[PDB]
Amino acid sequence: TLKQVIVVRDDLKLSRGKLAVQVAHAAIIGYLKSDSSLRRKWLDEGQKKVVLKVKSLEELLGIKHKAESLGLVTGLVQDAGLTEVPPGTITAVVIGPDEERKIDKVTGNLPLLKLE
Amino acid sequence: TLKQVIVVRDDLKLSRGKLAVQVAHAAIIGYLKSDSSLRRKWLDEGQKKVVLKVKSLEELLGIKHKAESLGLVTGLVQDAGLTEVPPGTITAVVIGPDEERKIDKVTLPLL
Structure with missing residues (x-):
């Protein structure tokens, strides 16, 4: 089973x-x-x-590093459209898609982003 | 400038x-x-x-209909993995990316 994991900062x-x-x-x-x-x-x-x-x-x-150490594909999100944060600000990281069991070893215990 | 719009439902x-x-x-x-x-x-x-x-x-x-009337590419979101709701449930609509001038027209009360 494949899965893509997206992690965002709330701070x-x-x-x-x-x-x-x-x-x-x-x-x-x-x-x-x-x-x-x-x-x-x-x-x-x-x-x-x-x-x-x-x-x-x-x-x-830390999550991004761990995923990369395992061999997973990662990505960083830097949105120049955000005008209240300094340039280069990192808002989120993406992992995969890739094998779910492998990605879970990294983010399997993180809380869900609740926008609802 | 190009932009993509994503709309969800509060109902x-x-x-x-x-x-x-x-x-x-x-x-x-x-x-x-x-x-x-x-x-x-x-x-x-x-x-x-x-x-x-x-x-x-x-x-x-209604937004999807309007976008389509303007020649904008639209897509419906139906998640088969979303077993919490019946199959075929439309969770969102995506429009674009396309010229923000055109898509801004498709954008009734929001939020």
Whole structure:
């Protein structure tokens, strides 16, 4: 089973609508950086995703590092459209799509991002 | 400037964390259905997006109808993995990316 994991920071003064935008950026970035075969199988399986959150940049990057150490494809989200944060600000990280069991070893215990 | 719009429904109550998932699904769907050249430029511009919410399914489909009348690419989001709701349930609609001047026209009360 394949899955794409998106992790966003909540420690930024971003509204629910702005966070949702960052989630959408992450989804696309992850798809674009993934293998053609992998992402095709992902789409056919329903492009499963889980969106989680962290409370700091260090925790966000810690997750990214761990995923990269395992060999997973990662992506960073830096939105120049955000005018209240300094340039280069990292709002989220994407992992996969890839094998769910492998990605879960990294983010299997993180809380869900609740925009509802 | 190019932009992609994603609209969700507040008359649809989803489980914890599911809303963010549907939004991500919409982004992908819109990207895939869009013109290769147009989306490429969109990405280079910073893949600008806006996420909105409407009253219910009727307003959501109304936006889809209006966008289609303007020649904008639209997509419906139906998540088979969302067993919490009946199959075929429309969770969102994605429009674009396309010229923000055109899509801004398709954008009734919001949120």
